[PDB]
Each structure stands twice: as C-alpha cells, then as structure tokens.
Amino acid sequence: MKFNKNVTASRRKNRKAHFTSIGLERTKLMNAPLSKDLKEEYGIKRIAVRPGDMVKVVSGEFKKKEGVVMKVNRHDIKIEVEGCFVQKEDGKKINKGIHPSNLRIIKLSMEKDRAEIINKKVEAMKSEVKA
Amino acid sequence: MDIVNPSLSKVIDIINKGKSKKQFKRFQSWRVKRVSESWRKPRGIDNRMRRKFGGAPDMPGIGYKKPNAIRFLLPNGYRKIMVACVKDLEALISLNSFYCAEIRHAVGSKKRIEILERAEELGILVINKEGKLVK
Amino acid sequence: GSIKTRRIKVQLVSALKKNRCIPQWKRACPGFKQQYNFTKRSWKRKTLKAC
Amino acid sequence: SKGTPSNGKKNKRNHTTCCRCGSVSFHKQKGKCSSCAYPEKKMKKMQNRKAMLKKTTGTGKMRHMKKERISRRAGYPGNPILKEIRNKI
Amino acid sequence: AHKYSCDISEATSVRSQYNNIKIKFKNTREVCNIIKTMELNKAIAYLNDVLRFKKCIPVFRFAKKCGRTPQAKEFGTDKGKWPVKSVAFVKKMLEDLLVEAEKKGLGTSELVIKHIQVNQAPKIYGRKHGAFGRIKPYNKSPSHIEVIAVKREH
RNA sequence: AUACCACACACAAGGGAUCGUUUGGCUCCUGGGACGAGGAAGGGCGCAGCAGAGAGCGAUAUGUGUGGGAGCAGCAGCAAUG
RNA sequence: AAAACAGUGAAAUUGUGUGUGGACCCGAAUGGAUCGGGCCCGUCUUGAAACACGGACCAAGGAGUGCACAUACACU
RNA sequence: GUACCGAGUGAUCGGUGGUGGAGGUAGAUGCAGAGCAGAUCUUGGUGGUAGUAGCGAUAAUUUGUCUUCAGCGGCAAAGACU
Ligand SMILES: [K+]
Ligand SMILES: [K+]
Ligand SMILES: [K+]
Ligand SMILES: [K+]
Ligand SMILES: [K+]
Ligand SMILES: [K+]
Ligand SMILES: [K+]
Ligand SMILES: [K+]
Ligand SMILES: [K+]
Ligand SMILES: [K+]
Ligand SMILES: [K+]
Ligand SMILES: [K+]
Ligand SMILES: [K+]
Ligand SMILES: [K+]
Ligand SMILES: [K+]
Ligand SMILES: [Mg+2]
Ligand SMILES: [Mg+2]
Ligand SMILES: [Mg+2]
Ligand SMILES: [Mg+2]
Ligand SMILES: [Mg+2]
Ligand SMILES: [Mg+2]
Ligand SMILES: [Mg+2]
Ligand SMILES: [Mg+2]
Ligand SMILES: [Mg+2]
Ligand SMILES: [Mg+2]
Ligand SMILES: [Mg+2]
Ligand SMILES: [Mg+2]
Ligand SMILES: [Zn+2]
Known part of the structure; x- marks a missing residue:
C-alpha cells in the first residue's frame, strides 16, 4: 500500500509521465541488469546500456544470442545488437531493435x-x- | 447423432411430429426493410390486425402454449443444462435420467478433452460432443 | 494598382512568402505526420483584405 | 435595380488596418476603430462574454509576466556581479 | 494481388484486370455483355467493324429512349449504338491477351472469352452553376474491369 | 421473357455501423491568487545548412555561470577542447 | 466547422454466376396448370382505402427527469 | 460479424462451420443519460427518374504541314469580321 498522497496512482497520469519523459528521466529507461560476476567486480546492480558493450538476449526471437551494442534509439526505446537482423525480399538486411529490459550485460x-x-x-x- | 431418452423412446416421434412450426412475424415487416421480424403488438386506431379482420394474420397468446410435460424438451427427449467446468458435471449425478449437458461455446480445446473424459465415467450425455474437437 | 502605401506593400510581401508547400525532405522524417499545408491559398478563391 | 446590377458600383473601401489591434476595422472618415475604439485611451466594451475571452491575457505570449513569476520563485536574486548593492539594500 | 470474381485454373487460361479507368460505366457493360462466350479472334474482328460504323453494339439494360437501327437485326432487336471511346479500350485490352497467350505457349486460336465483368468505381466530383443563384452536381462515373479467356477442350 | 423487372444464396464492388482501445474532456476537493513609465496586456515583422504552418527566441535571434553527462529522429556534417 | 487506430468491416445500393417467380402477405397442396381469404400504414375524428395531412431508401442519435414542501399507501 | 440448425405463446436465448485477433460471462443484489418506423425530426451515406433533359445569342470558316501523341496546339496560304 501507498500512504503518500502527493504521488499519483492514475493510469492516465502514469502513462503520460512515461512517454513524455526527457533528459535524465529518459536515461533511466535504458537500464539493464548486470551478470552475477560483474555484480562482484563492481558495486552496481544495473546500468544504462551504451554502444560497444556486450549483451546476452534473454527473451524473444534472438534468445541465447550474444553481441556488441551498435546503436541506442532514445525516441523509440530500442537497442540494436550486432547480428540480430531480418532479410527483405530484396535480400537486404535490416537490424531489428530490442527493448532494454530483455538484455543482460556480459562485458562493459x-x-x-x-x-x-x-x-x-x-x-x-x-x-x-x-x- | 441418433440417440434417445429410454423412458420416451416409443413416444418421441409422436411428440416431435406434434410440434407447431408457426411464426409470428411483425406486421408489415415484409413491406419495409427498416422494420425487423421481431414481434411487437399493433396499437393503431385503424389497424386491421388488432381489430382481427378475417384475412389478417394471427396474434400470439396463451392458447398456443404447450402442455407442461412436453415443454422445454429437446428432440432427443432430454432437457439441457449448461456446463463450463469439471465441477459442473458433479451436479447432474442425480438427474441424468432426464437432463443432458451442453458445453459453453467459449471453453477451449485443451479443457474440453478433460470434460469429456469425466462425462464418460459418470455416464452423462453431452450433446456438443464432436464440437470443435473433430480435427 | 501601381500606387501603394508602405503599409500595404509589407502586407503583400508577407502574404507572398507564406504561400508555399511542405518541403520534400520533411516527409521522410520519422516523427512528421502532416500531409498537405492547409494554409496555402489561390488569388482566384480568396481575398487578402489588404484593400 | 437593387440586386446584381448595383453590385457593380461597389469599388470604394471604408475600413483599413488599425495600428493598435490589427483588425482591418479603422473607419477612415469617422476617425475611429470599430473593434477597439482607437484613438480613445481605453479599449472598447466587448459585446458578450464569449467574444471578450478571445482577446484576454493568456491568449497571446505573456512574455514579461512569465519571467516575473520565475524571478519571484527564485527570490528576486538579480545579476550576480552586483550582489553587494542588493545586500546593502 | 487481386481476387478474381470466379475460379478457373491458371494453366490453360490468361487474365488481366484494371482499376479506376475513366471510361463510362453504363456504356462499358453493354459492350462487355455482347462479347461474352465469343471466340477471341471473332471478338477483335467485330470490334473493328463497330469503329468503322459497319456494325453496332445492341442495348438491353441501359437502353431507354435509344435510337432504332437496321444493324441491330443481327441480334434480334431494333435498338443499337456506337460507343467509340469504350470500344477502343476493350479492343486494346483483348489484343494484349493474344500476346500473353502466344508467349505462354498456348495456341493463338481456340481461345474463348469465358468470364468478363465491369464494376463501378468511386465518383469524381464536379459542379455547374444554375439560375437563381443555385449550384448543382456535375460528377464523373469511372469503372473497374476483369477478363479471363480459356482454351476450348474440343 | 433468350436479354426487362423482382426475390434468395455464393463471389467481387460501395460505404463506414458494431465490438475491442484512449498522452482528451467534465465534476468534486486542496493549494495559489504572483502585471505596467525599470514601457504592461494585445498586435506586427524578422531569426534554421537544406524550413511553409505551428513551437522557441530578438540583429548577442542556442551567450555566461552552476549541477549533471552521450548523443544530435531524415540527408549531409558536428561532439569528453562536452 | 470537419478529421482517432495505415484493426474489425453491418445495412442501403451495384456487377457476375446459379436457382425461383411476374407487387406482396396469411391458410392448404401438386409431376403440373393453382384454389380460398386479404384495399396503406401512422394520426386527429360521430365516421378514413380515401379526391384529409406526414412518409424515396438504410445506419446511428432522438422525448415524464432532478430538488423543495405538505400528502395516502406498502415495508422497518 | 455472417450463413445454417434447435429451444420459448412471446419479448428473446443456445449451439455448429467459415472470418476475426484480444478479451468475456452465469447467480443474487445497487445506481440509471436504460429499448424507436413516423416528429415538412438531426447528422452522414445511397437510389429510381437517366446514358435521359440539356451543353450551340454574337464575326465563319477551309486546306496543307509539323509536332502533339493525338490539343480546329503551332506555322504557311486563302476566306471573313470589329
Ligand atoms: K418455431
Ligand atoms: K377509427
Ligand atoms: K393449448
Ligand atoms: K490601390
Ligand atoms: K481575388
Ligand atoms: K472584423
Ligand atoms: K478596460
Ligand atoms: K438496375
Ligand atoms: K479504421
Ligand atoms: K479494412
Ligand atoms: K392528424
Ligand atoms: K372520395
Ligand atoms: K393538419
Ligand atoms: K430510423
Ligand atoms: K409509433
Ligand atoms: Mg458610388
Ligand atoms: Mg463616407
Ligand atoms: Mg431517342
Ligand atoms: Mg443554365
Ligand atoms: Mg448571382
Ligand atoms: Mg368532420
Ligand atoms: Mg409528402
Ligand atoms: Mg438507436
Ligand atoms: Mg495479441
Ligand atoms: Mg434518452
Ligand atoms: Mg432530346
Ligand atoms: Mg456588320
Ligand atoms: Zn483597433
């Protein structure tokens, strides 16, 4: 239960606060868990994913794959991982974006x-x- | 499916051939598409059906109601009860002489298998037995 | 006509620069949802009221 | 006749752009604006509540009034080079 | 993709369809009606005669107040017409199917027009000015077209 | 009634009802009640690398200082010397 | 003023194919000609099938409600 | 949502097969903006009439030639008109 009356529990208000976030609040959306070893190497439990870091995909089509983060799309909240792609009728390949929370960090x-x-x-x- | 209630087996055909096939269509539903077929009583000052002139159609009323014993009986000689759980069949265990079960439409395949297995061992007739589970 | 005041001329100059379609590159931008510029006008269909 | 043929003679223009309000309603012969009463000091009486709310504070930009509220929130701090003048006063 | 309005095998048939064409609906279906079940070379020959005013299109459904004509006797009626604009389009469309037939490896002969249908496309709006200060509609009525021809079993 | 007119059913057209959804509205409660001769409120005109409308800003039209810290949505270029 | 999802996609209305009829409804039937009964609804009116008025067609919206004051009944 | 089939004197209710792609009921009670054929009803969409009525007051137009790709468009030569 919540006893503080200054914080809202409205569905309409919580949703608007999510999608209209900016600045540091936007960075909080890009957080992912660290692996068990890294949680001994460093104090932190979670960090914002950046290019060049190494990640295991733990949910979806590309489950079990590992690779390097290529790009971070802040407006449409997605990460592009090296070697996770689909092929068009043309044979041309397009990287498919994964939501931050479906990843886990393996090397920083x-x-x-x-x-x-x-x-x-x-x-x-x-x-x-x-x- | 070709099954019959054993208590009525030698009578069921007389019963079935005796049921009326009359329909009570709403007046002038044949004339304009905006009036549906569903019965409403005519209330006009001039109306020929309300005033019961010969040649107008017949109106519903209590005289047409079936005998109390025959009423609600399906053509196989049973009355129906709706079911959606295994724990529902448990109610029919005393009544299986006269009542049969009909599984509700929204119950899915995986669950239907569990209902039918229980129906076999308890000895209850299910009328939707084939259902979606033919494949 | 040929005789104009300074106040009338600036109104015409501004009314002439605003009368343009959406530039063709904007249509490619991810966030952009407009189809056609509804503020475009024709001299045959509306008056400016510059007088 | 009073219909179509009389429309041909309608080539004079009695109103021009008002310098106070923009609304193309300054009557040149009367020397008065029909929207805002220029050159009188006060603005005109607006006919009804619906029509007056279309021209109230907050319908435009409110440039000065917004800045003042932010400065009041901050405690009127002023330019930081000149703190000593502020503190003395 | 397009769902043709009936079911005939891909082998032994040839097809075409077009949308929103700018030939007039009512004129086009009177043309299509008369060339149904006809052999393709016969159809192309007949339509050439219509362009030269040597034969006519008979009219049956969209036909009120139409003129009478000696050329209509070939189809057991008095009433006929010469809708040049629709005929030129249909003729081109049929000629292209003979190209497709030849290229596909059927014969150029024994092809019969088994299916053909016309549908109404959405209206294009226009206006005319009337008296007493009124404005009235002045719209255009285009069409959609399908054809399938098959090889006779004989 | 060979071909017209009507009705029924299957397929293709024509229109946008129904069901599922909602960063909007409305009502009640609590706080607030802060403009101007040091030029207000309201109007006009300019400012982008490709820029019409709208948003933001005044020829200093993305300047200075503090606290943070990873990208700038398209194309070309910029960025731990921020 | 209008304009939500690049969802679902009803009715009016149109084309093609296949069947059944010549305005249609009710009762009863044939392999097959059909037999019997029925004037157009709503509304004011002594009296409407009317030479009384409203209604071309389909969808969606569309009319005895809230408060105050006395009151009779039923229930606690 | 659409075809069929069953139950009820009836308002209505249930199932089966295709379409659809994420939510939905049965019992007992509570609150209501709670059921349409009509109002020369309101808004939106569509017919018959109908390939029909009309589209041609004024000086007038013909031939060749190129484009146009099928414009009495342009250019030469005639014939007219204000
Ligand atoms: K029945
Ligand atoms: K009466
Ligand atoms: K009875
Ligand atoms: K002038
Ligand atoms: K003009
Ligand atoms: K005005
Ligand atoms: K005042
Ligand atoms: K028709
Ligand atoms: K839609
Ligand atoms: K659709
Ligand atoms: K009346
Ligand atoms: K009479
Ligand atoms: K009257
Ligand atoms: K209605
Ligand atoms: K009524
Ligand atoms: Mg004058
Ligand atoms: Mg004057
Ligand atoms: Mg004629
Ligand atoms: Mg006219
Ligand atoms: Mg006029
Ligand atoms: Mg009288
Ligand atoms: Mg009338
Ligand atoms: Mg309704
Ligand atoms: Mg889903
Ligand atoms: Mg109501
Ligand atoms: Mg005529
Ligand atoms: Mg003369
Ligand atoms: Zn003014």
Whole structure:
C-alpha cells in the first residue's frame, strides 16, 4: 500500500509521465541488469546500456544470442545488437531493435566517462549504507 | 447423432411430429426493410390486425402454449443444462435420467478433452460432443 | 494598382512568402505526420483584405 | 435595380488596418476603430462574454509576466556581479 | 494481388484486370455483355467493324429512349449504338491477351472469352452553376474491369 | 421473357455501423491568487545548412555561470577542447 | 466547422454466376396448370382505402427527469 | 460479424462451420443519460427518374504541314469580321 498522497496512482497520469519523459528521466529507461560476476567486480546492480558493450538476449526471437551494442534509439526505446537482423525480399538486411529490459550485460564498454559514472554511484550508496 | 431418452423412446416421434412450426412475424415487416421480424403488438386506431379482420394474420397468446410435460424438451427427449467446468458435471449425478449437458461455446480445446473424459465415467450425455474437437 | 502605401506593400510581401508547400525532405522524417499545408491559398478563391 | 446590377458600383473601401489591434476595422472618415475604439485611451466594451475571452491575457505570449513569476520563485536574486548593492539594500 | 470474381485454373487460361479507368460505366457493360462466350479472334474482328460504323453494339439494360437501327437485326432487336471511346479500350485490352497467350505457349486460336465483368468505381466530383443563384452536381462515373479467356477442350 | 423487372444464396464492388482501445474532456476537493513609465496586456515583422504552418527566441535571434553527462529522429556534417 | 487506430468491416445500393417467380402477405397442396381469404400504414375524428395531412431508401442519435414542501399507501 | 440448425405463446436465448485477433460471462443484489418506423425530426451515406433533359445569342470558316501523341496546339496560304 501507498500512504503518500502527493504521488499519483492514475493510469492516465502514469502513462503520460512515461512517454513524455526527457533528459535524465529518459536515461533511466535504458537500464539493464548486470551478470552475477560483474555484480562482484563492481558495486552496481544495473546500468544504462551504451554502444560497444556486450549483451546476452534473454527473451524473444534472438534468445541465447550474444553481441556488441551498435546503436541506442532514445525516441523509440530500442537497442540494436550486432547480428540480430531480418532479410527483405530484396535480400537486404535490416537490424531489428530490442527493448532494454530483455538484455543482460556480459562485458562493459569503459570508453570515456564510464569509470567516473560508476564511481559516482558507488559513493552515493556507501554515504547512506554506513550511516 | 441418433440417440434417445429410454423412458420416451416409443413416444418421441409422436411428440416431435406434434410440434407447431408457426411464426409470428411483425406486421408489415415484409413491406419495409427498416422494420425487423421481431414481434411487437399493433396499437393503431385503424389497424386491421388488432381489430382481427378475417384475412389478417394471427396474434400470439396463451392458447398456443404447450402442455407442461412436453415443454422445454429437446428432440432427443432430454432437457439441457449448461456446463463450463469439471465441477459442473458433479451436479447432474442425480438427474441424468432426464437432463443432458451442453458445453459453453467459449471453453477451449485443451479443457474440453478433460470434460469429456469425466462425462464418460459418470455416464452423462453431452450433446456438443464432436464440437470443435473433430480435427 | 501601381500606387501603394508602405503599409500595404509589407502586407503583400508577407502574404507572398507564406504561400508555399511542405518541403520534400520533411516527409521522410520519422516523427512528421502532416500531409498537405492547409494554409496555402489561390488569388482566384480568396481575398487578402489588404484593400 | 437593387440586386446584381448595383453590385457593380461597389469599388470604394471604408475600413483599413488599425495600428493598435490589427483588425482591418479603422473607419477612415469617422476617425475611429470599430473593434477597439482607437484613438480613445481605453479599449472598447466587448459585446458578450464569449467574444471578450478571445482577446484576454493568456491568449497571446505573456512574455514579461512569465519571467516575473520565475524571478519571484527564485527570490528576486538579480545579476550576480552586483550582489553587494542588493545586500546593502 | 487481386481476387478474381470466379475460379478457373491458371494453366490453360490468361487474365488481366484494371482499376479506376475513366471510361463510362453504363456504356462499358453493354459492350462487355455482347462479347461474352465469343471466340477471341471473332471478338477483335467485330470490334473493328463497330469503329468503322459497319456494325453496332445492341442495348438491353441501359437502353431507354435509344435510337432504332437496321444493324441491330443481327441480334434480334431494333435498338443499337456506337460507343467509340469504350470500344477502343476493350479492343486494346483483348489484343494484349493474344500476346500473353502466344508467349505462354498456348495456341493463338481456340481461345474463348469465358468470364468478363465491369464494376463501378468511386465518383469524381464536379459542379455547374444554375439560375437563381443555385449550384448543382456535375460528377464523373469511372469503372473497374476483369477478363479471363480459356482454351476450348474440343 | 433468350436479354426487362423482382426475390434468395455464393463471389467481387460501395460505404463506414458494431465490438475491442484512449498522452482528451467534465465534476468534486486542496493549494495559489504572483502585471505596467525599470514601457504592461494585445498586435506586427524578422531569426534554421537544406524550413511553409505551428513551437522557441530578438540583429548577442542556442551567450555566461552552476549541477549533471552521450548523443544530435531524415540527408549531409558536428561532439569528453562536452 | 470537419478529421482517432495505415484493426474489425453491418445495412442501403451495384456487377457476375446459379436457382425461383411476374407487387406482396396469411391458410392448404401438386409431376403440373393453382384454389380460398386479404384495399396503406401512422394520426386527429360521430365516421378514413380515401379526391384529409406526414412518409424515396438504410445506419446511428432522438422525448415524464432532478430538488423543495405538505400528502395516502406498502415495508422497518 | 455472417450463413445454417434447435429451444420459448412471446419479448428473446443456445449451439455448429467459415472470418476475426484480444478479451468475456452465469447467480443474487445497487445506481440509471436504460429499448424507436413516423416528429415538412438531426447528422452522414445511397437510389429510381437517366446514358435521359440539356451543353450551340454574337464575326465563319477551309486546306496543307509539323509536332502533339493525338490539343480546329503551332506555322504557311486563302476566306471573313470589329
Ligand atoms: K418455431
Ligand atoms: K377509427
Ligand atoms: K393449448
Ligand atoms: K490601390
Ligand atoms: K481575388
Ligand atoms: K472584423
Ligand atoms: K478596460
Ligand atoms: K438496375
Ligand atoms: K479504421
Ligand atoms: K479494412
Ligand atoms: K392528424
Ligand atoms: K372520395
Ligand atoms: K393538419
Ligand atoms: K430510423
Ligand atoms: K409509433
Ligand atoms: Mg458610388
Ligand atoms: Mg463616407
Ligand atoms: Mg431517342
Ligand atoms: Mg443554365
Ligand atoms: Mg448571382
Ligand atoms: Mg368532420
Ligand atoms: Mg409528402
Ligand atoms: Mg438507436
Ligand atoms: Mg495479441
Ligand atoms: Mg434518452
Ligand atoms: Mg432530346
Ligand atoms: Mg456588320
Ligand atoms: Zn483597433
């Protein structure tokens, strides 16, 4: 049960809040679980998927496959994974997008600011965990 | 399906050949497409059917009602009960002399198999037995 | 006619730049849902009221 | 006759664009606008509630009024170079 | 894809269909009606004579107040007509099926027009001005067409 | 009635009812009740690499500072020197 | 003013094919000619098949409700 | 939603086979914007009449030749008119 009356439980309001999200709230939509080993290598339980990271598909047509993230579509919430595609009548191949939550991370791309992003989150935990 | 209630076997054909095939179509439903066939009583000041002139059609009424014993009886000599569960057949266990079962349309294939298996061992007649499960 | 005031001329200039169809590249954009520009006009069918 | 043939003579134009309201309703001979009463200081009485709500605050852009509300929320902080003047006052 | 209005085998038949054509509906079905069950070479010969005013199309359903003519006697009626615009279209359509027949490996002969039908397409709107300040409709009535020809068993 | 007119059924046309769905409306409750001579409210005109309408913004028409952090929806180009 | 899903896709109305009839309904039948009975509904009116008025056709919408005050009945 | 078949004096109810592609009832009670043929009803869609009525006041048009791809369109030569 919910006892805070400032938070809404309306279906109409929850749905609008989802689809009209922007900025950091949009980034929260692209989160995926880490594998059991990585959850010992790092403190975090889940992270936003980025290009170059390595993922196992755990639901759908392409179940059991593994591959590298090629692109991240923020407007239509989908991820393109290397080697997951369909062939047209022409023989031409189109990558099919997968929803973030159907993936699981196997190796992290550590290019750019990723190491600082991870550090910032670990500290935020401990700050309140140790109190 | 060619089955009959054993208590009425030597009588069922007299009963069936005795049932009326009269229809009570709404007045002038033959004249304009916007009036459906479903019965409504005419209430006009001039109307020839309400006033019962010879040559107009007949109106419904209590005189046409069937004898209390024959009423509701299917052509195989049983009355019907609707079922949708295995636990429904359990009700018929005392009544199987006069009543038979008809599985509701929305019950799917996997479940129908379980209903029919139970019907065989309890000794209950099911009239939709073939149903969708012919394939 | 040939004689015009400055106020009348600016109204004509603005009414002439607005009178154009949707550019052909926009139709390819994923989010774009318009078919035809309903604000397009013809001199044979409407008056501007520039007077 | 009073129908079609009299329509041919209708080539003069009594109203032009008003400089206060845009509405092509300034009567040149009377020296008055029929929408907004220019050049009188106050705006005209509008005929009914339906017609007046079409021209109320919030029907346009409200540029100044929106900024003022944001500044009030923030506590009227002013330009940060000049904090010392603010603090003294 | 197109669901032709009847069932005949793909082998031993040839087909065509068109949509929204801009020949006039009522004229076209009077043409189609008379060439049904006719042999294809006979059909093409007959339609050539209509273009030259040497033979006519007889009329039976869309026929009120039509003219009488000695050419109609060939079909046991008095009433006939010469709808040039519809005839030119149907003739072209039939000639193309002989190309298809030849290319498909049937004979150019023993082909018979087994099925042919015309349907109404949606109206194209227009206007005319009337008296006393009125405006009245002035619309156009196009058509859709199917043909299937088969080889005689003989 | 060979071919016209009517009705029934199957297939193709013609129209948008019905059933399933909804980032909208309405009602009640609670908060709020903040404009202008330091030029308001309202009107017009300009500003995009390809740009009509609408949205955003004023010739500084995506500038400065703080907190964050991964892409910019099409095509060509940009981006941890943000 | 109109305009929701690139869903489902009714009726009026049209073409082709196959059958049955010559406005149609009720009662009763034949291998087959048909026999008997029936004027067009709604409405005001002493009185409508009317030379009384409304109605070309189909879909969807479309008319005894809410509050206050006395009241008789049934129920607690 | 559409064909058939059964149950009821009747308002209506049930099943079977194709189409459709995600929701739906049976019993007992509660609240109502709760049932249509009609109102020269309201909105939207479609017939018969009908390939019919009409489309041609004014100076007038012919021949060749190219396009057009089938425009008395253009160009030459005549014939007219304001
Ligand atoms: K019956
Ligand atoms: K009477
Ligand atoms: K009785
Ligand atoms: K002028
Ligand atoms: K004009
Ligand atoms: K005005
Ligand atoms: K005022
Ligand atoms: K007809
Ligand atoms: K639709
Ligand atoms: K459809
Ligand atoms: K009356
Ligand atoms: K009389
Ligand atoms: K009257
Ligand atoms: K109705
Ligand atoms: K009535
Ligand atoms: Mg004058
Ligand atoms: Mg004057
Ligand atoms: Mg004639
Ligand atoms: Mg005229
Ligand atoms: Mg006029
Ligand atoms: Mg009288
Ligand atoms: Mg009338
Ligand atoms: Mg209704
Ligand atoms: Mg589904
Ligand atoms: Mg109502
Ligand atoms: Mg004539
Ligand atoms: Mg003269
Ligand atoms: Zn003014």
